[PDB]
Amino acid sequence: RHPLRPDPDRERRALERAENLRKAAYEMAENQHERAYHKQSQIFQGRFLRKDNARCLRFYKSIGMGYHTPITAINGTYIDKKCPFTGNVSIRGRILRGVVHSAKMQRSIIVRRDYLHFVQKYKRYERRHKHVAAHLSPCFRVKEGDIVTIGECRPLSKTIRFNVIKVEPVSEAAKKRFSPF
Amino acid sequence: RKIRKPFESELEKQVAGTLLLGTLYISSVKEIAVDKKAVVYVPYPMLQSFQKNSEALILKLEHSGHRFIIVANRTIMKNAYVFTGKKSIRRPRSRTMTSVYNCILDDICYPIHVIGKRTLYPNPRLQVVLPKAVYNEVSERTKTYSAVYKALTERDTEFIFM
Amino acid sequence: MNVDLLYPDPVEEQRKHKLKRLVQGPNSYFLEIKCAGCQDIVVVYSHANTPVFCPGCTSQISIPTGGKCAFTSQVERYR
Amino acid sequence: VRINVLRDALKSICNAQRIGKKQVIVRPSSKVIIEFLQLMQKNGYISDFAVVDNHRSNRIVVNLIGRLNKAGVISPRFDIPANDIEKWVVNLLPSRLFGHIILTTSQGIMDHIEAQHRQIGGKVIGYFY
Amino acid sequence: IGMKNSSGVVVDAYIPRKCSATNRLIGPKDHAAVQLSVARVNDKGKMIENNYVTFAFCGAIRSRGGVDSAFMLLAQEHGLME
Amino acid sequence: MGRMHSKGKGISRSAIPYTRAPAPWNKYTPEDVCEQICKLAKKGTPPSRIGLILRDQFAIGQVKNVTGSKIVRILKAKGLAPEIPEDLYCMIKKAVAIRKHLERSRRDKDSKFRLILVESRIHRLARYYRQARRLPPTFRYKSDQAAALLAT
RNA sequence: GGCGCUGCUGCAGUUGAAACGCCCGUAGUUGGCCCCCCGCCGCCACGAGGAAACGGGAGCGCUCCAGGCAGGUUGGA
Ligand SMILES: [K+]
Ligand SMILES: [K+]
Ligand SMILES: [K+]
Ligand SMILES: [K+]
Ligand SMILES: [K+]
Ligand SMILES: [K+]
Ligand SMILES: [K+]
Ligand SMILES: [K+]
Ligand SMILES: [K+]
Ligand SMILES: [K+]
Ligand SMILES: [K+]
Ligand SMILES: [K+]
Ligand SMILES: [K+]
Ligand SMILES: [K+]
Ligand SMILES: [K+]
Ligand SMILES: [K+]
Ligand SMILES: [K+]
Ligand SMILES: [K+]
Ligand SMILES: [K+]
Ligand SMILES: [K+]
Ligand SMILES: [K+]
Ligand SMILES: [K+]
Ligand SMILES: [K+]
Ligand SMILES: [K+]
Ligand SMILES: [K+]
Ligand SMILES: [K+]
Ligand SMILES: [K+]
Ligand SMILES: [K+]
Ligand SMILES: [K+]
Ligand SMILES: [K+]
Ligand SMILES: [K+]
Ligand SMILES: [K+]
Ligand SMILES: [K+]
Ligand SMILES: [K+]
Ligand SMILES: [K+]
Ligand SMILES: [K+]
Ligand SMILES: [K+]
Numbered sequence A: 001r002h003p004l005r006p007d008p009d010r011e012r013r014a015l016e017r018a019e020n021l022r023k024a025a026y027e028m029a030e031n032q033h034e035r036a037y038h039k040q041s042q043i044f045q046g047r048f049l050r051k052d053n054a055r056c057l058r059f060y061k062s063i064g065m066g067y068h069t070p071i072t073a074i075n076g077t078y079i080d081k082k083c084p085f086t087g088n089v090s091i092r093g094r095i096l097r098g099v100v101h102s103a104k105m106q107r108s109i110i111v112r113r114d115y116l117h118f119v120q121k122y123k124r125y126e127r128r129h130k131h132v133a134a135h136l137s138p139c140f141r142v143k144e145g146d147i148v149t150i151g152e153c154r155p156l157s158k159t160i161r162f163n164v165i166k167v168e169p170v171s172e173a174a175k176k177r178f179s180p181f
Numbered sequence B: 001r002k003i004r005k006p007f008e009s010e011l012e013k014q015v016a017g018t019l020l021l022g023t024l025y026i027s028s029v030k031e032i033a034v035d036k037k038a039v040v041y042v043p044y045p046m047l048q049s050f051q052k053n054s055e056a057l058i059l060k061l062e063h064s065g066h067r068f069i070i071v072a073n074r075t076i077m078k079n080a081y082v083f084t085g086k087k088s089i090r091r092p093r094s095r096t097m098t099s100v101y102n103c104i105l106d107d108i109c110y111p112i113h114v115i116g117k118r119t120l121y122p123n124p125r126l127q128v129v130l131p132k133a134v135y136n137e138v139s140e141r142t143k144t145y146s147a148v149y150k151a152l153t154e155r156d157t158e159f160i161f162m
Numbered sequence C: 001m002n003v004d005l006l007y008p009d010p011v012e013e014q015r016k017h018k019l020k021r022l023v024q025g026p027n028s029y030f031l032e033i034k035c036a037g038c039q040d041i042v043v044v045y046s047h048a049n050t051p052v053f054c055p056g057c058t059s060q061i062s063i064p065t066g067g068k069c070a071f072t073s074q075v076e077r078y079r
Numbered sequence D: 001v002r003i004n005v006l007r008d009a010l011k012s013i014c015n016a017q018r019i020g021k022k023q024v025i026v027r028p029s030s031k032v033i034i035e036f037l038q039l040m041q042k043n044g045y046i047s048d049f050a051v052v053d054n055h056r057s058n059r060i061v062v063n064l065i066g067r068l069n070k071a072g073v074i075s076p077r078f079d080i081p082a083n084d085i086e087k088w089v090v091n092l093l094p095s096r097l098f099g100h101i102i103l104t105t106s107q108g109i110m111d112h113i114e115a116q117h118r119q120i121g122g123k124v125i126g127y128f129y
Numbered sequence E: 001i002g003m004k005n006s007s008g009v010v011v012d013a014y015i016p017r018k019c020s021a022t023n024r025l026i027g028p029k030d031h032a033a034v035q036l037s038v039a040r041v042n043d044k045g046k047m048i049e050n051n052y053v054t055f056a057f058c059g060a061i062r063s064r065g066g067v068d069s070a071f072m073l074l075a076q077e078h079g080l081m082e
Numbered sequence F: 001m002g003r004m005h006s007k008g009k010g011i012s013r014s015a016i017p018y019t020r021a022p023a024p025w026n027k028y029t030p031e032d033v034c035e036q037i038c039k040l041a042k043k044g045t046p047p048s049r050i051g052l053i054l055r056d057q058f059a060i061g062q063v064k065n066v067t068g069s070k071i072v073r074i075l076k077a078k079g080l081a082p083e084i085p086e087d088l089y090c091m092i093k094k095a096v097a098i099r100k101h102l103e104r105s106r107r108d109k110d111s112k113f114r115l116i117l118v119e120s121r122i123h124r125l126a127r128y129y130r131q132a133r134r135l136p137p138t139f140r141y142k143s144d145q146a147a148a149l150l151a152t
Numbered sequence G: 001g002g003c004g005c006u007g008c009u010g011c012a013g014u015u016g017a018a019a020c021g022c023c024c025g026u027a028g029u030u031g032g033c034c035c036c037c038c039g040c041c042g043c044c045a046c047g048a049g050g051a052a053a054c055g056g057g058a059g060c061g062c063u064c065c066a067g068g069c070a071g072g073u074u075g076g077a
């Protein structure tokens, strides 16, 4: 890391995101409808009592492969052990793209992938599709029709082996087409 | 120096000096051979101003050694949809070769409207049709239009009359 | 006798349908008429089917007819 | 509706020559039709043509010299590997010595002899002989 | 010329005639085909012996009556008519 | 035309001039025919009739040749384009008329047949406009509600 | 296999067997012409990587042969 930190003079003020995260943590403590207190495993919970600010209050990482961390994950207040940026999982294996078929589950979506199958006797093709279940971190929000890029992780449920890592929005009320990519 | 945009690239000084319309100025005069040698460029958002009085303007120039055409300065863009990072920017349709080369042949003879084009496949050539009534006042200017069009587009061109 | 399709005779080309000509073109045209009581002159479409008035008159001076239109008591030209 | 402009052009040309006409008009025009007529011309099967502009889909006027036994298109445009060309040659062509199958490849439009001269494949669009 | 051997010799038995109008080959047993010849005067309104022009027409052009105009057009190209 | 919902096969149409230029007698500038277009649109004239009036009174063959744009685009540029395009509006009007005729005459099956044809055309065109972003994504033709939307 | 009597190449549907009584219409299939010199598919070519036997195929007289991998510096490409 050859270069070192150019000089803005509003940095320490702009770290008011510390009180932001702190009061979000203290709001989670008051929602007595919950049964478990949710917290990241990478973070002490004694760093919140301190005032010198010297220690970070939220954990995040980079996933590699030229995919950059969204700022909504860096400055969010949610808890997700299955989020690839702020949870306890990793991305490795195949990386694919598809379209959102359904977003009706809890932090889970269905993805529709399209492809062609050649039949040699008839010298022609047929159009085919498959459905893939994927995990949706709160740092993204999607609707049906949007393009997504998903990447492989370890097994996460009976049907899920992938995680949403990029979103390309698609306007509502547009003609739905084959769109293989 | 107030009649041209470029400065200091100076083949014909005298055109700017003679042209001194008080609000108008030109750029980038050119010389094309082939007899009586020959093209004057103008900034695009003044063509409609220049073409207003252009029949009686070209006379007051044809500097008897040369012949003068008034054309607009037009940009041709290479790619449609340049993909710069995360987005694609769309090439304006007026900036293609097919549009600009069609505008040049219309501005080459502006007071007169061509009434037909054909492409002959004999090296392909272009045949341009004009109304017969105005056969005079173009008859002596046709070889200049053909040579200049080949110089600016490299298309063979012949002229016939309605 | 030897006709060339690339340079048809205009006379026998005008008698064909406007669309199956070599280069499609309109059949209509404009023309000048003179008001029967006013010195001036107005330019009128040859296939009009909408009101056309005098500069002075309030009586409509055209009769729509399903083809070329006729006129009431006026004398015409071609430009 | 109208789908294959090249098919209609070639049917019109074959009809006109079978009658014994000197010229024929085909409309509309297109880039593909001009490429097909250019190849037919360069092999010597037709004379001059002319594309006439109408600020629409243009017309073409074709001059005929009585050398065209048949011309057609292959729909759909099946793709052909380099080694299947000959299994197509003995299918469409009257012999192995004259006639032409036209392919589109990433090196342009070309006949089959040049396609095996550059040892590549492509997609078939038509044939004449 | 006709078909050639691999060395350069024509291995063709005979060459059919071609139509002067439609360039089609005549072929044997096409008994509607006609060859005919025109005088080519050239000499003060009187013909010259054994100096003619000669055309041929296949049966397809005759079966529809196309020859009356095509023969005329062919003649106007050889300086025998106008 | 006359061929989507019948066995017509008619070809009657207009063919515009090859040359794209003002008229020899054209005095008008774009800024002064835009004036007449906007005065006619404010008065309540539909865009297909504005072209008729400019053709028949002002001796202008094509508005595009004298301005460089088209009539509906100029209306849109001065904020005077309609909420609903003219052709869809006319089809809805004809549907309302046929339904109101059928309210007194329940034995007219020919009119019911033509009502079906008109409404099928309406749905197809509405889908076109919707996916093209010329109409709200929630636009829907409703037979029962169509009479009072014509006022707005 | 004969069999183009299963037809992608490549059948038949007026009368031999066979065009729904007709109109609308979703899924599906198909869709004129135009900008070239960007991106993403398909497609074509060439590579990398993974099994032999079988199947092709270079060389070799189990006396020939079906074989086999021999052999007189070699070889199983
Ligand atoms: K988290
Ligand atoms: K695919
Ligand atoms: K497959
Ligand atoms: K399919
Ligand atoms: K689970
Ligand atoms: K599960
Ligand atoms: K599809
Ligand atoms: K006709
Ligand atoms: K007509
Ligand atoms: K008429
Ligand atoms: K129909
Ligand atoms: K009809
Ligand atoms: K018809
Ligand atoms: K009904
Ligand atoms: K109905
Ligand atoms: K419908
Ligand atoms: K309906
Ligand atoms: K539709
Ligand atoms: K519909
Ligand atoms: K309305
Ligand atoms: K069989
Ligand atoms: K078989
Ligand atoms: K067989
Ligand atoms: K059949
Ligand atoms: K039966
Ligand atoms: K039966
Ligand atoms: K029967
Ligand atoms: K049927
Ligand atoms: K059926
Ligand atoms: K039906
Ligand atoms: K239907
Ligand atoms: K339909
Ligand atoms: K459908
Ligand atoms: K579909
Ligand atoms: K199908
Ligand atoms: K499809
Ligand atoms: K279709």
Ligand SMILES: [K+]
Pocket: G043
């Ligand atoms: K491929």
Ligand SMILES: [K+]
Pocket: D104, D105, D106, D107, D120, D121, D122, G044
């Ligand atoms: K290729």
Ligand SMILES: [K+]
Pocket: G051, G052
């Ligand atoms: K092995």
Ligand SMILES: [K+]
Pocket: none
């Ligand atoms: K060795």
Ligand SMILES: [Mg+2]
Pocket: C017, C018, C027
């Ligand atoms: Mg007509």
Ligand SMILES: [Mg+2]
Pocket: F004
């Ligand atoms: Mg239909």
Ligand SMILES: [Mg+2]
Pocket: F001, F009, F010, F011
């Ligand atoms: Mg029709």
Ligand SMILES: [Mg+2]
Pocket: F012, F013, F014
């Ligand atoms: Mg008509």
Ligand SMILES: [Mg+2]
Pocket: G003
């Ligand atoms: Mg069989």
